[PDB]
Amino acid sequence: KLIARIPARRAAYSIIRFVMDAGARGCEVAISGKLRGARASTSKYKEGYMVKSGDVTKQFVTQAVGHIPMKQATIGIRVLIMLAQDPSGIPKESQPDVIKVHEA
Amino acid sequence: MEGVKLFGKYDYSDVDFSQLDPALVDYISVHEKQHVMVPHTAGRYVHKRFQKVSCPLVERLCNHLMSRGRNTGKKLLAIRIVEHAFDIIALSTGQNPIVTFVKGVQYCGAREDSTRRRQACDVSPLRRIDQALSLITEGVRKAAFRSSRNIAECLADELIAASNNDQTSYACRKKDELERIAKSNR
């Protein structure tokens, strides 16, 4: 998208809607660098919820960093996507935060 | 557990703690549990505040006499020196060492001190027998540094005069400065 001159709002909320509707607990999108002004300035677009700490980051959080070269300057693209655990799908075990009590 | 004697020589049957005085004796740590064949031990004494009392007193000296910066560690060195004091003490006078030792630990550590005017506070019995063993052993190494004389002897010279209350001693001289400063400031 961002090669073909879409606004960064519309480019993120394309994919951040597409991630969540497909099936995921949260996602974050960062578009770091130089649009508009001489100074670079950071966009961050987030929905859902997004776990940042511990071991449990490594199991659940998918992420991917990159960059776009342009006429003007080098932007950085960066998309973190958190998953739901399946019952033996394709993670297995739930988070160490949560517990579930049985019904009587 | 019938003989029960220090270095395999001296005994704790003597030492008359009740006889020595009132107070002071308690933090002394010579009461049965403290007695051991060798003053070396696996200490666990710095865990919670007052556990330093429950260790033996002769060990507590051997730790003080572990300085400075070269003699750190090497306790196994220090318990030779304190042995070779306690031969020189015993075989000169004929008293056994532990009696004349604990009398030295009484009369060194000054009652009172300048808490930073400056005001003259009193002391705990714990902090007396601490600053007994410092001001003995401070004087020993300060004397023994450069002196052409073995430190086992220079311990034994300090340690006899501490019992008899003489101003030969680096201990019992230095209290009468520190106690008089507390009397002056007040």
Binding site: - | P22, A23, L24, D26, R49, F50, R111, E112, D113, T115, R116, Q119, C121, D122, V123, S124, P125, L126, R127, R128, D130, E179, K183
Partner: protein, 61 residues
């Protein structure tokens, strides 16, 4: 000449740098009375303190 107190109760701590305790004491001389004195080191209740001067209480609390 060299009198002997004993600590009834530790009220708290004092000094600018928190260096010193102070304590209610009942005289071991047995004359009787209670003196509120600032001790230096660390004190377990029931400890005995030798005082060069029995007179003057510390200041305030």
């Amino acid at each position: 000449q060299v009198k002997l107190a004993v600590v009834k109760q530790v009220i708290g701590r004092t000094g600018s740098r928190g260096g010193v305790t102070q304590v209610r004491v009942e005289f071991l001389d047995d004359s009787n009375r209670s003196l509120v004195r600032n001790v230096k080191g660390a004190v377990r209740e029931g400890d005995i303190l030798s005082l060069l001067e029995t007179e003057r209480e510390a200041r305030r609390l």
